[PDB]
Write a protein that binds this ligand. Structure first.
Ligand code: R9Y
Length: 330
């Protein structure tokens, strides 16, 4: 089997991407945020505290003839920014782009943090990291991809995120028309539950490539590119007037600036992030200070190749017995 679904930016900055997901029978379509940095499929639901729902589409398990309470199971996830959601668990039929999994754990939110309530376009997250990170207790549950894997033509999914435009998540096949050149594959460590890999270096604009190992994760659920402070300082030093602002929470730059590209290495290959992809717009409406798309990871504990980096590439998440990541230009 295969599946193919379009993923659409939630706003004009590409802060996140939503993909329609069919849950239950008859289908209830929710727009979920496919997250390769986490491993829970959770949704706003008829069980979510009413004051914490503000415009999201909800899953109502009592209206699905295939929903079944997973007795005794609860979940609770804290994200890296401090956001959180928790609740109970149903199993139900879940389909993405024509690919159907029966018995998928659908984690129904009873509580969500304000950051989620405020995002009316996101109806939940569909985790695509390794199932070892799934938070369901007392019986950990598998991700949608893990459940689908054996049925897929090939045990892979691909992320092809658009810049200011829709893109595609495919399951079970490589679309060889979706990228240019060849795909360069690189090793993955699953020891932390992430799609963790080592970039071979970077360049700023037309500058020379610096060969240096940068361990990080491929994370579709994070917006920005978080890299070591040395790398990030080298990037922003090429933007006149750019500076790190403790009050704003990162590097900012004059909105009148033209930003240089940023290149990262994948083995001997190179992925170029155009300068425009690094502009996240005014820090507040009407400001002439703009927020940068490359930020320091120093306070995180891990480097994160988020959407800023991934949308410059066609990315293969190869879930074979020994997983690997593939990157191609496009
Ligand atoms: C608060 N917020 C809502 C928008 C989508 C989303 C995704 C993640 C996963 N990195 C964390 C928070 C969050």
């Amino acid at each position: 089997s295969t599946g193919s679904a379009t993923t659409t930016p939630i706003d004009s900055l590409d802060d996140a991407y939503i993909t329609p997901v069919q849950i239950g029978t008859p289908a209830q379509t929710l727009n979920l945020d496919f997250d390769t940095g986490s491993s829970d499929l959770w949704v706003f639901s008829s069980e979510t505290t009413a004051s914490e729902v503000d415009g999201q589409t909800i899953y109502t398990p009592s209206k699905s003839t295939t929903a079944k309470l997973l007795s005794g199971a609860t979940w609770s996830i804290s994200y890296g920014d401090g956001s959180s959601s928790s609740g109970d668990v149903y199993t139900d039929t879940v389909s993405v782009g024509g690919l159907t999994v029966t018995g998928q754990a659908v984690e129904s939110a009873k509580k969500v943090s304000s950051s989620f309530t405020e995002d009316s376009t996101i109806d939940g997250l569909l985790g695509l990291a390794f199932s070892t990170l799934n938070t369901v207790s007392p019986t950990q549950q598998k991700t949608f991809f893990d459940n689908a894997k054996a049925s897929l033509d090939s045990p892979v999914f691909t992320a092809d995120l658009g810049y200011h435009a829709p893109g595609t998540y495919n399951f079970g096949f490589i679309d060889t028309t979706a990228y240019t050149g060849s795909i360069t594959y690189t090793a993955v460590s699953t020891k932390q539950g992430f799609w963790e890999w080592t970039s071979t270096g970077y360049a700023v604009g037309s500058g020379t490539f610096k060969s240096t190992s940068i361990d990080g994760i491929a994370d579709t659920g994070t917006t920005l590119l978080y890299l070591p402070a040395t790398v990030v300082s080298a990037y922003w030093a090429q933007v006149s007037g750019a500076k790190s602002s403790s009050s704003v929470g990162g590097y900012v730059f004059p909105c009148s600036a033209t930003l240089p590209s940023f290149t990262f290495g994948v083995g001997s290959a190179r992925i170029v992030i155009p300068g425009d992809y690094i502009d996240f717009g005014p820090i507040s409406t009407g400001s002439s200070s703009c927020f940068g798309g490359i930020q320091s990871s120093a306070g995180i504990g891990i480097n994160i190749f988020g959407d800023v980096a991934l949308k410059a590439a066609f990315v293969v998440f190869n879930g074979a017995t020994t997983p690997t990541l593939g990157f191609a230009s496009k």
